[PDB]
Structure 1
């Protein structure tokens, strides 16, 4: 993908033979000059599909093209200082001049930039391409791999007529036959994403894969997406009818990795919908990653994050205080239940307040006269549809700051010093907050 330039001589690096690596005039249309990181420490020649290496970790040896072995300590290179390149461990650098001789010199002949940039070669490092479908259960692409007595350094379409880019998850396909499609924009590609009718969002159900939660997140990110986030009923329902035939575990983007808070969506989505399995969430430590369970009726259960399963991706009048085009008012005299306090606001021209920003919650706790020991009703409720919390005024639920252990009770209140929320019985007399459009 990149050439290997040298400032002091204004030339690149030319791969001549499987045992001859020299320099030449910098040409970007020369296969013999292109290289690419196949691992975090291996540098492969695009021409010969062979990795650069040395015979020994000693001074003044020839740097030619070896066979890419993941365990070979003589192929591991890493960037020290800035543009200095040396074998992993030894202070023996990539000295130059016919063949490129490894040598303990660190002069300008041992400092190398990417042709076209002023950065070291490690600036465009290797990116693990987690495979899709295939028979490899979503393992990372392994370059270079042999197929039909030919080596490939990037995703190919040989052995096919459909143009689907695929790779070999092992160095030798014709022996192991382990492959998987590449997270790239295929000539088709749109078969992998099941588009939502209503919201027109795309989902990708990777059922026949075995990756950890962190790996599953990377595979969604590199595809320009993010792990699943269920914030609707129509979204949860559409996914249940889809994965109905499936029965294995499926990672989703619901985690509790944050040591400070509880459960949260990895894509910053507001926690407004619940669909837990009977017995979940359970009080185990480290079980901080939620997986969908289409076999057990598409419900959520938290397991250890290192488990290897499937995963799904996704692409003002008086007494009324003004803030952001709305007017607010706190009631503390006569404490009322959630339905009685609701009817009061709508006779006054407003509704139970709806918090859509952290700034709006901060305005209530800091300026509105909110005492730290108050317990005030808010319009949040799942009274109508179970487990699906909705606002009173019909405004969208875009911001949710729950309390530790909350939501543990079809009605929610503001309590604690931070002004966080908590669900409780709708039949308890309390104060309440109100909101009306100015």
Structure 2
């Protein structure tokens, strides 16, 4: 809910807008539209009944707070929460005050008459707060809703079904002039028809090809829909997404990025990066685009490019020299360096396997308790021997966690099979060819 009632505990009364020149108080009534308010920017509180913003004529003491036409550049319409429930103008020690019983006033006192809460709760007004709502479909290419907006010479404060029940908004204040609109990312009858569902996995995908947002704007649009940018974690998922996007050509943002400075490629939804499908030549630009014109393969671009995007909604005894953690025994070998398959065999001769890693806590145990050194480079069990570009663990356990080094995974089109190693001060992983003599990390039950 975006609409709240401004409440003062001490008087047990609520702000009520009577006219554009009168903002009084009255007995609280949630069924009275004149008492409902809403944020429309980082700093502006707007009346729902009148579609006018609360403001002041000057930043001076004891002036009347009345309703002004909303202006995102007006210093006199910007409100911020101070201390806790203190509400005051931006940049001054002047406060939203209950006023003399003989209209709401801007006053210098910070007493109980200047502390306001959202009716029905115990949180300040800034708790609801304004979040930009990126639009879906429409002609505005995913631009943000503009509140308030004018449609057929009426003012609208929230998303409307005015003019099937689909909720929409104008992305500029005068929709009657600019004719720019989009649909709101809210639940309504028919909202789920914006999502395409994979019958097999029950995961829903939303393809927003008409839009043109930056990578970060795209990430916000999915997250405000209780989703996240597309992560492609398995061969079936890529196959389905190739089918959905066969009839498209323009690039679409997906969640694969390398924006974290100490680590490499990762999905924004923290899914494991175990399936690769780069376009020939990539990765040569820290954000990844899916190119539906080239069979839905991936290429990395500058994160400020304006593209479409895809959202995704859904999901106690150890031998000698072996050390325990979480019901398993681990050991690092450095004596005789072996290639990956010879190391795989030696772990199995010893009763275990090349190590799998499923949680970050398990990764931390290896780099700090097993004698691991920062200059090391050790085999682990992740590999794509069977299917190129699809990493699996040699012990058959699921890949639920990946921590790639900066600049990793590297060059997969330079070789025919990829084994991965553990190297660096953080124990992050890097893939490489398998015919290299190296140390290795074994793990057993």
Q: Who is 2:199 aligned against? A: 197
Q: What 5-or-longer segments of structure 1 have no aligned partner?
A: none
Distance in structure 2 (CA, Å) of the matches to 1:399 and 1:302: 22
Q: Who is 2:413 aligned against? A: none
> 1:328: how far off?
4.6
Change (3 A) 1:101 1:414: closer
Q: What 5-or-longer segments of structure 2 have no aligned partner?
A: 411-416
Q: Is 1:353 matched with 2:378? A: no
Q: After superposition, what is the alpha-carbon deviation per residue over 1:56-89, rounded to whole angstroms, capped at 9, x for unaligned? A: 4444443322222333333222233443333334
Change (3 A) 1:63 1:323: closer
Distance in structure 2 (CA, Å) of the matches to 1:264 and 1:185: 30
> 1:235: how far off?
1.4
Is contact 2:264–2:409 with CA below 8 Å preserved after alignment?
A: no
> 1:333: how far off?
5.4
Change (3 A) 1:415 1:7: closer
Distance in structure 2 (CA, Å) of the matches to 1:260 and 1:435: 27
**TM-score with structure 1 length normalisation?**
0.88
Q: After superposition, what is the alpha-carbon deviation per residue over 1:202-233, rounded to whole angstroms, capped at 9, x for unaligned? A: 11111111112221111111111111112212
Distance in structure 1 (CA, Å) of the matches to 2:70 and 2:263: 45
**TM-score with structure 2 length normalisation?**
0.87
Change (3 A) 1:350 1:136: same
Q: Who is 1:120 aligned against? A: 124
> 1:383: how far off?
2.1
Distance in structure 1 (CA, Å) of the matches to 2:367 and 2:107: 66
Change (3 A) 1:49 1:422: closer
> 1:399: how far off?
1.9
> 1:187: how far off?
0.9
Distance in structure 2 (CA, Å) of the matches to 1:108 and 1:323: 56
Q: After superposition, what is the alpha-carbon deviation per residue over 1:238-276, rounded to whole angstroms, capped at 9, x for unaligned? A: 212211211222111122221222222211122222222
SS at match of 1:412: strand
Greater alpha carbon shift after TM alignment, 301-310 vs 367-376: 367-376
Distance in structure 2 (CA, Å) of the matches to 1:19 and 1:421: 65
Is contact 2:262–2:405 with CA below 8 Å preserved after alignment?
A: no
Aligned length: 431
Distance in structure 2 (CA, Å) of the matches to 1:239 and 1:222: 22
Q: After superposition, what is the alpha-carbon deviation per residue over 1:381-430, rounded to whole angstroms, capped at 9, x for unaligned? A: 11221222222222211122333333225222334454433323222344
Q: Who is 1:296 aligned against? A: 294
Distance in structure 1 (CA, Å) of the matches to 2:73 and 2:424: 56
> 1:90: how far off?
4.3
> 1:176: how far off?
1.7
Instruction: Kindly report the root-mean-square deviation, in angstroms, between the aligned alpha carbons of the 2 structures.
Output: 2.7
> 1:131: how far off?
0.8
Is contact 2:265–2:408 with CA below 8 Å preserved after alignment?
A: no
Greater alpha carbon shift after TM alignment, 236-245 vs 366-375: 366-375
Distance in structure 1 (CA, Å) of the matches to 2:353 and 2:191: 48
Q: After superposition, what is the alpha-carbon deviation per residue over 1:140-165, rounded to whole angstroms, capped at 9, x for unaligned? A: 11122222332221211121xx2111
Greater alpha carbon shift after TM alignment, 335-344 vs 134-143: 335-344
Is contact 2:86–2:116 with CA below 8 Å preserved after alignment?
A: yes
Distance in structure 2 (CA, Å) of the matches to 1:362 and 1:58: 58
Change (3 A) 1:177 1:339: same
SS at match of 1:36: strand
Is contact 2:263–2:403 with CA below 8 Å preserved after alignment?
A: no
Change (3 A) 1:103 1:260: same
Is contact 2:261–2:406 with CA below 8 Å preserved after alignment?
A: no
Is contact 2:198–2:204 with CA below 8 Å preserved after alignment?
A: yes
Is contact 2:36–2:49 with CA below 8 Å preserved after alignment?
A: yes
Q: After superposition, what is the alpha-carbon deviation per residue over 1:20-64, rounded to whole angstroms, capped at 9, x for unaligned? A: 211111222211111111112221111122222233444444332
Is contact 2:94–2:106 with CA below 8 Å preserved after alignment?
A: yes
Is contact 2:265–2:404 with CA below 8 Å preserved after alignment?
A: no
Change (3 A) 1:279 1:102: same
SS at match of 1:128: coil
> 1:320: how far off?
6.3
Distance in structure 2 (CA, Å) of the matches to 1:108 and 1:368: 60
> 1:96: how far off?
3.7
Distance in structure 2 (CA, Å) of the matches to 1:156 and 1:279: 46
